[PDB]
């Protein structure tokens, strides 16, 4: 296999075993001041997401042209407020919300973003960016527009003095630093079967299936309650200590913890365990991301909850996640998704998650290190 674009990049070769931790290439000390050229009739436009009209155009581009499953049944449907949460965390920069418009119509047809993140990779901590929401309009696909978007965001990140990035993708590219698998816990099995998310699996009836996936009506962990403002510091402390066991993690300031965890309805939920002493000892979190269901006369949207960061010090992990399922169910979710990273393997089978189709590969740009098992990945991106 060759990669006409990826082969020119500072990433390791697929198939080479890596034994040397460090940058692929030295930092560039002068950077190109001019944007890379797009094809004729298209232009750059940095997108002001504080503008309601412009945020809606981005919502529409992603709603119509972002990630689908291999059979074109489901497409992510990130909401405008969720996009604002994802794309404006602390340290966000306007030039890192990189759009492509058609010159004549103004139509938004491409996007890529970067947000700043401190990343701990093995024994190094490095200021990086996280690249997300790369999207080319379906009518514009396969015209090598994706490499221009990647090069242009790279140049704009370089201008800010940053030379490493982290990203995930569904496809295998040079070269995954780790490979995760999605698993799903049914919460409304009837809808999931009706919309062909899952199959009636041999040999159980529908009635057996609903019974199998039935959950308690309220969580069982004593003192579980939503996170509040007073909890920001101890959620920050617990998260920092907990992550030290993994090899790829974020290093978040207290302000980033407030942004990523403080509850926002229909975007992010976090529940803490406040014990009999008033001490918060654990927390669970999950974010809300629906997917459009296409070509179906009755069901239009599948409501999914996604496991975020789950920190146990005193409640067993297995119990926290069981309460996470119960809460997702009570909130009206159809499915709970989680990856096999961190210590998630310890609960996935027990709590009746089924394996799904498709990997999520983790990558670093301009950094070589050995790859790691999923159990060592402790970074979750939206
Ligand atoms: C210092 C800072 C550095 C900053 C940069 C860090 C790097 C970040 C890299 C990006 C991190 C993104 C993280 C996310 O957001 S992952 C989510 C990706 N987005 C979607 O899946 C939405 C649906 N698909 C699309 O919108 C288009 O198919 C996209 C835009 C994905 C490709 O558009 P198109 O289909 O019109 O293709 P093309 O003709 O323009 O180009 C074909 C070339 O592009 C390579 N390709 C295909 N898919 C991906 C992919 N997901 N990551 C990286 N490369 C990908 C492909 O191998 C080929 O290269 P090569 O095989 O010839 O070599
Ligand atoms: C319900 C549903 N809706 N759609 C849209 C799909 C594909 C499913 N089935 S899934 O649940 O099992 C699932 C899910 Cl959620 C996601 C991915 C995946 C693939 C490629 N890229 C990403 N990114 C997400 C994180 N950062 C940007 C890249 C995710 C694959 C699968 Cl297969
Ligand atoms: Cl190319
Ligand atoms: Cl099911
Ligand atoms: Cl390796
Ligand atoms: Mg293209």
d(CA 128, CA 166): 7
- Contact by Cβ (8 Å): 185, 334: no
How many angstroms does the Cα of residue 287 sit away from the middle of ligand 1?
24
Q: Can you state the angle between helices 254-261 and 232-243, rounded to 10 degrees? A: 100
Pairing status of strand 124-136 against strand 108-121: antiparallel
Pairing status of strand 268-274 against strand 224-226: antiparallel
Using a 6 Å CB cutoff, which residues line ligand 1? 3-6, 65-67, 129, 131-136, 141-147, 150, 153-154, 157, 162-165, 167, 169, 171, 173, 365-366
CA-proximal residue: ligand 1, atom 20 (nearest): 67
Cα-trace Rg, the chain: 21
d(CA 305, CA 321): 12
Which domains can be identified in the chain, with CATH numbers? 1-382 (3.40.630.170)
- Chain centre to alpha carbon of residue 263: 17
Pairing status of strand 42-46 against strand 178-186: unpaired
Least Cα distance to 184 among 357, 376, 56 occurs for: 357
- Judge if the beta carbon of residue 354 lies within 6 A of ligand 2: no
Q: Helix H segments across 160-231?
A: 189-194, 206-213
- Contact by Cβ (8 Å): 377, 29: no
- Contact by Cβ (8 Å): 333, 325: no
Least Cα distance to 152 among 59, 235, 44 occurs for: 44
- Write the burial class of residue 136 (CB in 10 Å: 0-12 exposed, 13-18 middle, 19+ buried): buried
Give the method of determination: X-ray
Task: Give the resolution to one decimal, in Å.
Answer: 2.1
Peptide bond into 243 cis (omega under 30): no
**Containing H/E element for 98?**
strand 97-102
For CA atoms 253, 369, 357, 59, give the dihedral sign: positive
Q: Which residues of 99-123 are buried (b: 16+ CB within 10 A; e: fewer)?
A: bbbbeeeeebbbbbbbbbbebbbee
User: How far, CA to CA in Å, does 88 sit from each of 113, 193, 365?
Assistant: 10, 36, 22
- Contact by Cβ (8 Å): 165, 10: no
CA-proximal residue: ligand 1, atom 21 (nearest): 67
Least Cα distance to 325 among 353, 295, 346 occurs for: 353
Secondary structure of 248-292 as H, E, C letters:
EEECCCHHHHHHHHCCECCCEEEEEEECCCCCEEEEEEEEECCEE
Name the phi and psi angles at 179, rounded to 5: -130, 125
CA-proximal residue: ligand 1, atom 32 (nearest): 146
């Amino acid at each position: 296999r060759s990669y006409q674009f990826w082969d020119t990049q500072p990433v390791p070769k697929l198939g080479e075993v890596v034994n040397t931790h460090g940058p692929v290439e030295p930092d560039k000390d002068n950077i190109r001041q001019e944007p890379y050229t797009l094809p004729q009739g298209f232009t750059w436009d940095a997108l002001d997401l504080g503008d309601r009209g412009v945020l809606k155009e981005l919502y529409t581009l992603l709603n119509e042209n972002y990630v689908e499953d291999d059979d074109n049944m489901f497409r992510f449907d990130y909401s405008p407020e969720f996009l604002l949460w994802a794309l404006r965390p602390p340290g966000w920069l306007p030039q890192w919300h990189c759009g492509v418009r058609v010159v004549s119509s103004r139509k938004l047809v491409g996007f890529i973003s970067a947000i700043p993140a401190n990343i701990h990779i093995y024994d190094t901590e490095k200021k990086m960016v996280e690249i997300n929401f790369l999207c080319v309009h379906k009518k514009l696909r396969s015209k090598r527009v994706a490499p221009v978007l990647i090069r242009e965001i790279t140049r704009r990140v370089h201008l800010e003095g940053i030379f490493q990035a982290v990203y995930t993708a569904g496809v295998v590219l040079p070269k995954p630093v780790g490979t995760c698998r999605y698993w799903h816990r049914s919460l409304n099995p009837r809808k999931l079967i009706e919309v062909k998310f899952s199959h009636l699996s041999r040999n159980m009836t529908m009635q057996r299936t609903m019974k199998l996936y039935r959950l308690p009506e309220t969580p069982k962990t004593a003192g579980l309650r939503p996170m509040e403002t007073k909890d920001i510091p101890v959620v920050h402390q617990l998260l920092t200590r907990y992550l030290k066991q993994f090899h790829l993690t974020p290093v978040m300031s207290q302000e980033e913890v407030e942004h990523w965890f403080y509850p926002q309805e229909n975007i992010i939920d976090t529940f803490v365990v406040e014990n009999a002493n008033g001490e918060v000892t654990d927390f669970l979190s999950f974010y809300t991301l629906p997917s459009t269901i296409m070509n179906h006369p009755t069901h239009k949207s599948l409501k999914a909850a996604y496991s975020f960061y789950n920190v146990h010090t005193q409640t067993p992990l297995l119990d926290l996640m069981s309460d996470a399922l119960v809460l997702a169910k009570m909130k009206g979710f159809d499915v709970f998704n989680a990856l096999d990273l961190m210590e998630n393997k310890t609960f996935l089978e027990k709590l009746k998650f089924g394996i799904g189709d498709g990997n999520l590969q983790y990558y670093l740009y301009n950094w070589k290190c050995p790859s790691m098992g999923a159990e060592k990945v402790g970074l979750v991106l939206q």
